[PDB]
């Protein structure tokens, strides 16, 4: 709930840490144009945890929402904001023709129409230099061989659905097995020992027996896998003890 | 950039040949209600051969 987001070329990233993931406050908003998670399901975020989650904010001309996706090409996809092929997150985009649009013309957004080379994923290029397209060395002024690469938008409410300003929010979280802080309001129980019971520390469900071995885990390591990539040892988030996950009878 | 199209039963087929495949000029036209391709991706449009 912000009045004005950042520009396309100057998209702002918000770091989130030590949070209780409760995404139920987002479903009660207006029906979003495109709510598609590329690595998870939208109804499963409240039952999982996140290591590092970042939120990006940028407003586009609406019809360019298809460009914010892995493997897509275009102006914004190659010059302003690119998503990697191994992207794991969710894309949230809704209509903002009533907020980020003016009847006389809103000129507070740029999209970097011209650029020398393609932009790499998850980068920001806010250089306001004059794009030299010709051979003569451009002296930073507008000329027949070099123009202004930063072009303004024509956001007006008179345009139909498709040219209106659409606020896009990209949630880039990391679900890799690692010491995390954001897990949600999931409640805690008692720590039993030497019995076949379930375990759910940071979303890892299963059935095993805790043995409390003498494994020396490093501060940045919490999960450990065997040859078959099966997590057989975990570090308790609350207590600094080491507990192994051994299969039952 | 046409004022009036044809009828449904009399749909006109326009043959395109000996030109440049530049579909980037279509994105700045009036917003489309459904832009769905069944053989290729819409962003490979202005790159392929026809």
């Amino acid at each position, epitope marked *: 709930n912000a009045t004005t987001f950042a520009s396309v070329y100057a998209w702002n990233r918000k770091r989130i840490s030590n949070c209780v993931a409760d995404y139920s406050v987002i479903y009660n908003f207006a029906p979003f144009f495109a709510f598609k998670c590329y690595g998870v399901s939208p109804t499963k975020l409240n039952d999982l945890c996140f290591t590092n989650v970042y939120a990006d904010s940028f407003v586009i001309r609406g019809n360019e929402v298809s460009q914010i996706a892995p493997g897509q090409t275009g102006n914004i996809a190659d010059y302003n904001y690119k998503l990697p092929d191994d992207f794991t997150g969710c894309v949230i985009a809704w209509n903002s023709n009533k907020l980020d649009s003016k*009847p006389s013309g809103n000129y507070n957004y740029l999209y970097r129409l011209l650029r020398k080379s393609k932009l790499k994923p998850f980068e920001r290029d806010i250089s306001t230099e004059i794009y030299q397209a010709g051979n003569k060395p451009c002296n930073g002024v507008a000329g027949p061989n070099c123009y202004s690469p930063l072009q303004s938008y024509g956001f*007006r*409410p*008179t*345009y139909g659905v498709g040219h209106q300003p659409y606020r896009v929010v990209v949630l880039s979280f990391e679900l890799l097995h690692a010491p995390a802080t954001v897990c949600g309001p999931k409640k805690s129980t008692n720590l039993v020992k030497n019995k076949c019971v379930n375990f759910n520390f940071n979303g890892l469900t299963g059935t095993g027996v805790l043995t409390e071995s003498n494994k020396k885990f490093l501060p940045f390591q919490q999960f450990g896998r065997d040859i078959a990539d099966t997590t057989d040892a975990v570090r308790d988030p609350q207590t600094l003890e080491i507990l192994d996950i051994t299969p039952c009878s | 950039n046409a*004022t*009036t199209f044809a009828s449904v039963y009399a749909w006109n087929r326009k043959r395109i040949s000996n030109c440049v495949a530049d579909y980037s000029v279509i994105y700045n036209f009036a917003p489309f209600f459904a832009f769905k391709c069944y053989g290729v991706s819409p962003t490979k449009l202005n790159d392929l051969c026809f």
Partner: nanobody, 121 residues
Framework: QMQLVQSGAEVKKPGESLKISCKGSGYTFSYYWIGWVRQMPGKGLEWMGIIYPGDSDTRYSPSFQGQVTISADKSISTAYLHWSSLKASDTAMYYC??????????????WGQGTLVTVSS
């Protein structure tokens, strides 16, 4: 009865803003495209652009893209033609036209009374 009434004659000097009007009555002023046609003394007709009463879908002439802006007021059913930084070659006869019940959307079957716009130093 459908009829188009325009403002009186406006005589100004180069370098001064000007915003003439042309009110239409006798019909629903929400679906008929309103446009302006320029006619220089001794020359033919010159089309500058059209507007829609519902939403401002302005399609200006390729020679009048940023040289002139067109607007309208749907609340009072009156179209406007605002100018900025007038020149000596802007003195001409301007009309306001609208589409009819039959034909294309840019047929302009009806016309106005005409506003005499002259500029001189």
């Amino acid at each position: 009865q459908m009829q188009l009434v325009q403002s009186g004659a406006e005589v100004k000097k180069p370098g001064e803003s000007l915003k003439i009007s042309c009110k239409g009555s006798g019909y629903t002023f929400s679906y008929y495209w309103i446009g302006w046609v320029r006619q220089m003394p001794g020359k033919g007709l010159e089309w500058m652009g059209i507007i829609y009463p519902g939403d401002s879908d302005t399609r200006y002439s390729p020679s009048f893209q940023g040289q002139v802006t067109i607007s309208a007021d749907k609340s009072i059913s009156t179209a406007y033609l605002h100018w900025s930084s007038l020149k000596a070659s802007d003195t001409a006869m301007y009309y306001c036209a609208r589409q009819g019940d039959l034909g294309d959307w840019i047929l302009l079957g009806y016309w106005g009374q005409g506003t005499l716009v002259t500029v001189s130093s």
